[PDB]
Scaffold this active site. Structure first.
Site, PDB file in Angstrom:
ATOM      1  N   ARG A   1      11.227 137.030 -12.826  1.00 25.96           N
ATOM      2  CA  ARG A   1      10.740 136.496 -11.560  1.00 25.96           C
ATOM      3  C   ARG A   1       9.217 136.566 -11.595  1.00 25.96           C
ATOM      4  NH1 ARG A   1      12.756 138.018  -5.450  1.00 25.96           N
ATOM      5  NH2 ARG A   1      12.012 140.111  -6.011  1.00 25.96           N
TER       6      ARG A   1
ATOM      7  N   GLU B   1      14.013 130.778   0.383  1.00 24.95           N
ATOM      8  CA  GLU B   1      13.638 131.935   1.182  1.00 24.95           C
ATOM      9  C   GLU B   1      12.438 131.640   2.079  1.00 24.95           C
ATOM     10  OE1 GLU B   1      11.243 134.068  -2.596  1.00 24.95           O
ATOM     11  OE2 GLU B   1      12.647 135.227  -1.362  1.00 24.95           O
TER      12      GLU B   1
ATOM     13  N   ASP C   1      13.125 137.616   2.767  1.00 22.00           N
ATOM     14  CA  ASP C   1      11.926 136.783   2.915  1.00 22.00           C
ATOM     15  C   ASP C   1      12.157 135.699   3.950  1.00 22.00           C
ATOM     16  OD1 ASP C   1      10.510 137.076  -0.344  1.00 22.00           O
ATOM     17  OD2 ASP C   1       9.493 137.394   1.567  1.00 22.00           O
TER      18      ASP C   1
ATOM     19  N   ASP D   1      11.420 146.669  -0.349  1.00 25.51           N
ATOM     20  CA  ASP D   1      10.394 146.010  -1.146  1.00 25.51           C
ATOM     21  C   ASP D   1       9.603 145.102  -0.206  1.00 25.51           C
ATOM     22  OD1 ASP D   1      11.770 143.458  -1.068  1.00 25.51           O
ATOM     23  OD2 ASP D   1      11.671 143.277  -3.273  1.00 25.51           O
TER      24      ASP D   1
HETATM   25  O1  LIG Z   1      15.640 138.605   0.154  1.00 22.00           O
HETATM   26  C1  LIG Z   1      14.784 138.142  -0.632  1.00 22.00           C
HETATM   27  O2  LIG Z   1      13.652 137.664  -0.060  1.00 22.00           O
HETATM   28  C2  LIG Z   1      14.525 138.820  -1.914  1.00 22.00           C
HETATM   29  O3  LIG Z   1      13.730 138.263  -2.673  1.00 22.00           O
HETATM   30  C3  LIG Z   1      15.104 140.194  -2.048  1.00 22.00           C
HETATM   31  C4  LIG Z   1      14.307 141.192  -2.838  1.00 22.00           C
HETATM   32  O4  LIG Z   1      13.330 140.812  -3.494  1.00 22.00           O
HETATM   33  C5  LIG Z   1      14.727 142.631  -2.791  1.00 22.00           C
HETATM   34  C6  LIG Z   1      14.962 143.346  -3.959  1.00 22.00           C
HETATM   35 CL1  LIG Z   1      14.861 142.567  -5.453  1.00 22.00          CL
HETATM   36  C7  LIG Z   1      15.287 144.700  -3.929  1.00 22.00           C
HETATM   37  C8  LIG Z   1      15.397 145.384  -2.721  1.00 22.00           C
HETATM   38  C9  LIG Z   1      15.171 144.692  -1.536  1.00 22.00           C
HETATM   39  C10 LIG Z   1      14.857 143.336  -1.575  1.00 22.00           C
HETATM   40 CL2  LIG Z   1      14.540 142.594  -0.092  1.00 22.00          CL
HETATM   41 MG   LIG Z   2      12.179 137.203  -1.592  1.00 21.79          MG
END
Ligand SMILES: O=C(O)C(=O)CC(=O)c1c(Cl)cccc1Cl
Ligand SMILES: [Mg+2]
Ligand SMILES: [Mg+2]
Ligand SMILES: [Mg+2]
Length: 716
Positions: free
Chosen positions: A328, A423, A451, A622
Site C-alpha cells: 500500500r 474510502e 477513512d 491507525d
Molecule cells: O478503513 C480504512 O480506511 C482502512 O484503510 C483501514 C486501515 O487502514 C486500518 C488498518 Cl490497516 C489497521 C487498523 C485499523 C485500520 Cl482503520
Molecule cells: Mg483507509
C-alpha cells in the site's frame, strides 16, 4: 548538504545510497537512467498532482458554502444532487463495461479468503504476515476468547485439557460442516488412511469416505498411516495433522495433533496509515523491509518455504508457503523532504512510493536465493494498493503515474496493478467511472470504511452535528456504500477476475465476536476482507468455508441495491439526540483514543497501536480511526454540541490513564501533568482544534509536523 543532485532534485543521501546499493542491483536497470527518470517523472506529474489537490479544496469550499446558505432542516435531495452535478462532484455514470486486467495471480482472481494488513516498518510483523498463509486453528481457538474462558476452561500457565478438549470439538464440528463424511462425524474418527487414491476415515463400527471425494487434496507420510491429510473446500486448504505421540495428539481419539488452515491468502505491506514515516531515514527503513520481503532474505526469524504434499493418486506437488504480497503506497496528498527540489520544496510522496516500491517489487518477480525460488507474482504483476483517491480523474492520474514508472523501470505496460480503496465520498458516488479509468489495471476494490467515515464527516462538516462515532457504522449511507461497492465490482465483471473487498476488524481481542459477526462480509459477496493479525486471518478463514462466496456473487449479478440518494444521506443527528452523560462519554471516548494513538505516533514513530476505548475494548488504531475521532469532535465543536473547555478537560482527564497504559516503556515520556510541554499532547489537541481546516480532515499534515518536531528536539 547531505543530499545528492539529480536534475532539479536533491535526494537525501541515505535514500540515494539505499536505492543504489540495495534496490537497483539485480534489476538490470541502469542507475543513471533510473535517477534521470525519477527527476523526469517528478517534473512532469507534479503540476497535475497539485491541481488535483486544489480541486478537492475548491469542491469542499463550494459544499461548505452550500450548507451555510441554507436553513431548511430536511436537505432537499433533488437540489443537493443537482448542485453536486453542477460543480463537477457527481459525474455521469459510464456505459456498462468489463475490466480487462490480465496477468493476475490466482490468489486474487479466484481464491476467496482473508487479507491481512501489516505495517511494513515492523520487520517481525511483516515476516509473520507473509508466513500467515498457513496458521494453526488449535492455537487460534485455544489462545483467543472464541473458546470462552468459562469455569474449568480457563487459560493457565500450562495446558488445560478441559479447554483443549473444547478446541478439539470445535474443530471437529468445523470439519463436519466443511468436508462432510458420507456417514458419521469426524468427532468419532479413529484413523485416516489413503486407499486406491481415496481418503478412508475409520469410525468405531465401520469406515467411510468423503461425501464429496473431490475435497481430498493429498497427504504426507505413508498412505497406510499418514502424518497428515490435506483437504480443500471453496478453494481453501485444510490440513489435519496426525501425531498420536504429540502433547495434544495423545488425548485425541484419532491421534490428531492440529488442524492447519490456509489463512492469509494475501497480505498488504503497508506504507500508509499503519506506519509513521516522516523523513528519508523512516522511508528507507520501510523500503528495506519491502526489499527483504521481495528478495526472500528478510530476517528479524525468516520467510517460509513452500509446502510439499503427496497427491491422492501418489504423485508429488507443492503449495505456496507465503501470502501473496500487495504494497500500500501513500495517496496523493503528502510530500516528504526525503527529496526536495532546488527551491527547497518537498516532493510528492505518492510519486516517490510508486517509483521506489515498484523498483523494489521487481525483486519479487524473480527467483530468490534464500527460499526455493518463490516468486511473489508468478504471472508477472506488481500489486499496489492506492488509498485515499477522490474520483475518476485521480484514478486516471494514478494509472498515468504507474505507466510512466513502468517506462522508467523498463517494465511492460500495466505490470503495476492497482487495488482501489473506495474510502472517499467522491470515489463512492463515481465508483463505476473510477473502475473504468483503471479498467486494465484494477485488481480489487475495497471499502475502507473508516477513512470513508472520516470523509463523510468532513464533507458535510457545515451541515450540522453528526451522530456518534459508534452510530456511524450502522448509518444508512454506509450500508448503501457497502452494497454499492459490491454491485459496481460485480457489474464490471470482477467475479473470477478481481477481488471485491471489505474492511478491517479492529477489536483485536474480541475474536468470538469477530467469528460471530464478520461472516456478514463474505455473505455480502466480498471475496476478501481485512484482518489485523495472523490469528484473526486463521479465524476469518472459517467464514469462507461456511459461505460459498462465488455462488453468492453469482446470485447478486444484475442487482442494484443502493441508489445515489441512499449514498448521499448525510448522518446528521436528530434534534435532542443525546443526554449530557452521553455527550461526555463520546468526548471521553474520542479523546482517550486520540491521545493513546498520538502519543506513540509522535514520541515513538509507531503508526498502529492497540488503544482501549471508553468501554475498555482494545482497538487497533491507525490514521483512519484517528481521522474519524478528530473530525467528529471538530464537528461537535463546530456546531455547539461541546465547548472548547469540554475538549480540554477530557484531554486532560484521559491523558494520565494513557500514561498509565504505557508505563515503563523505557522510551515512554508521560504527558501529564505538564501537558503543554508534551509535543504529543499538543499534537492531539491540534488535531481536534484544527480538524475542520485540515484538507478533507486528513491527519498527516499535523502528525508529520509534530513527529518531526519531536525528532528535532531529541537531536539537541
Ligand atoms: O478503513 C480504512 O480506511 C482502512 O484503510 C483501514 C486501515 O487502514 C486500518 C488498518 Cl490497516 C489497521 C487498523 C485499523 C485500520 Cl482503520
Ligand atoms: Mg483507509
Ligand atoms: Mg471554510
Ligand atoms: Mg460448499
Amino acid at each position: 548538504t547531505d543530499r545528492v543532485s539529480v536534475g532539479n532534485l536533491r535526494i537525501a543521501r541515505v535514500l540515494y545510497d539505499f536505492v543504489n546499493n540495495e534496490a537497483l542491483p539485480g534489476t538490470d536497470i541502469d542507475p543513471d537512467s533510473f535517477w534521470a527518470g525519477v527527476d523526469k517523472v517528478v517534473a512532469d506529474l507534479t503540476p497535475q498532482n497539485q491541481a488535483l489537490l486544489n480541486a478537492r479544496d475548491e469542491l469542499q469550499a463550494q459544499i461548505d458554502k452550500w450548507h451555510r446558505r441554507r436553513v431548511i432542516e430536511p436537505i432537499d435531495m433533488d437540489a443537493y444532487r443537482q448542485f453536486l452535478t453542477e460543480i463537477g462532484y457527481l459525474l455521469p455514470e459510464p456505459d456498462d463495461f468489463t475490466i480487462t486486467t490480465s496477468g493476475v495471480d490466482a490468489e486474487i482472481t479466484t481464491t476467496a479468503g482473508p487479507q491481512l494488513v501489516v505495517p511494513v516498518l515492523n520487520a517481525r510483523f511483516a515476516l509473520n504476515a507473509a508466513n500467515a498463509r498457513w496458521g494453526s486453528l488449535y492455537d487460534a481457538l485455544y489462545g483467543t476468547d472464541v473458546i470462552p474462558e468459562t469455569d474449568g476452561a480457563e487459560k493457565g500457565p500450562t495446558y488445560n485439557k478441559v479447554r483443549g478438549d473444547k478446541v478439539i470439538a470445535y474443530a471437529r464440528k468445523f470439519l463436519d460442516d466443511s468436508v462432510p463424511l458420507s456417514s458419521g462425524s469426524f468427532g468419532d474418527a479413529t484413523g485416516f488412511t489413503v486407499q486406491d487414491g481415496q481418503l478412508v476415515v475409520a469410525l468405531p463400527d465401520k469406515s467411510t469416505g468423503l461425501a464429496n471425494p473431490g475435497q481430498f487434496a493429498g497427504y504426507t507420510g505413508a498412505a497406510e498411516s499418514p502424518t497428515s491429510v490435506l483437504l480443500i473446500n471453496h478453494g481453501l486448504h485444510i490440513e489435519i495433522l496426525i501425531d498420536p505421540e504429540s502433547q495434544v495428539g495423545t488425548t485425541d481419539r484419532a491421534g490428531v495433533k492440529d488442524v492447519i488452515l490456509e489463512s492469509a491468502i494475501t497480505t498488504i505491506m503497508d506504507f500508509e496509515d499503519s506506519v509513521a514515516a516522516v523523513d528519508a531515514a523512516d522511508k528507507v527503513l520501510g523500503y528495506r523491509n519491502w526489499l527483504g520481503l521481495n528478495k526472500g532474505d528478510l530476517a528479524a526469524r525468516v520467510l517460509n518455504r513452500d509446502r510439499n504434499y503427496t497427491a491422492p493418486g501418489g504423485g508429488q506437488f507443492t503449495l505456496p508457503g507465503r501470502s501473496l504480497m500487495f504494497v500500500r503506497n501513500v495517496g496523493h496528498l503528502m510530500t516528504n523532504d526525503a527529496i526536495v527540489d532546488t527551491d527547497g520544496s518537498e516532493v510528492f510522496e505518492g510519486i516517490m512510493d510508486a517509483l521506489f516500491t515498484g523498483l523494489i517489487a521487481i525483486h519479487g518477480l524473480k527467483a530468490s536465493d534464500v527460499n526455493g525460488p518463490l516468486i511473489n507474482s508468478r504471472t508477472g504483476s506488481i500489486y499496489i494498493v492506492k488509498p485515499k483517491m477522490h474520483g475518476p480523474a485521480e484514478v486516471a492520474f494514478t494509472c498515468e503515474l504507474f505507466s510512466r514508472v513502468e517506462d522508467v523501470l523498463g517494465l511492460p505496460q500495466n505490470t503495476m496493478k492497482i487495488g482501489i480503496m473506495d474510502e472517499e465520498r467522491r470515489t463512492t458516488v463515481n465508483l463505476k467511472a473510477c473502475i473504468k479509468a483503471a479498467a486494465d489495471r484494477v485488481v480489487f476494490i475495497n471499502t475502507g470504511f473508516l477513512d470513508r467515515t472520516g470523509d463523510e464527516i468532513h464533507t458535510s462538516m457545515e451541515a450540522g452535528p453528526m451522530v456518534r462515532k459508534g452510530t456511524m457504522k450502522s448509518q444508512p449511507w454506509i450500508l448503501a456504500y457497502e452494497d454499492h461497492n459490491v454491485d459496481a465490482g460485480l457489474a464490471a465483471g470482477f467475479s473470477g477476475r478481481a477481488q471485491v473487498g471489505k474492511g478491517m476488524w479492529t477489536m483485536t481481542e474480541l475474536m468470538a465476536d469477530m467469528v460471530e459477526t464478520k461472516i456478514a462480509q463474505p455473505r455480502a459477496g466480498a471475496s476478501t476482507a481485512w484482518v489485523p493479525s495472523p490469528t484473526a486471518a486463521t479465524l476469518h478463514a472459517l467464514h469462507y468455508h461456511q459461505v460459498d462466496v462465488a455462488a453468492v456473487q453469482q446470485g447478486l449479478a444484475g442487482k442494484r441495491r443502493a441508489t445515489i440518494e441512499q449514498l448521499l444521506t448525510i448522518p446528521l443527528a436528530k434534534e435532542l439526540a443525546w443526554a449530557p452523560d452521553e455527550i461526555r462519554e463520546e468526548v471521553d471516548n474520542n479523546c482517550q483514543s486520540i491521545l493513546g494513538y498520538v502519543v506513540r505516533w509522535v514520541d515513538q514513530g509507531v503508526g498502529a497501536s492497540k488503544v482501549p476505548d471508553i468501554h475498555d475494548v482494545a482497538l487497533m488504531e491507525d490514521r483512519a480511526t484517528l481521522r474519524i475521532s478528530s473530525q467528529l469532535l471538530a464537528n461537535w465543536l463546530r456546531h455547539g454540541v461541546i465547548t472548547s473547555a469540554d475538549v480540554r478537560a477530557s484531554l486532560e482527564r484521559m491523558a494520565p490513564l494513557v500514561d498509565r497504559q504505557n508505563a515503563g516503556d523505557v522510551a515512554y515520556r508521560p504527558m501529564a501533568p505538564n501537558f503543554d510541554d508534551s509535543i504529543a499532547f499538543l499534537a492531539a489537541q491540534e488535531l481536534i482544534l484544527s480538524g475542520a481546516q485540515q484538507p478533507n480532515g486528513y491527519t498527516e499534515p499535523i502528525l508529520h509536523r509534530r513527529r518531526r518536531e519531536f525528532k528535532a528536539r531529541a537531536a539537541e
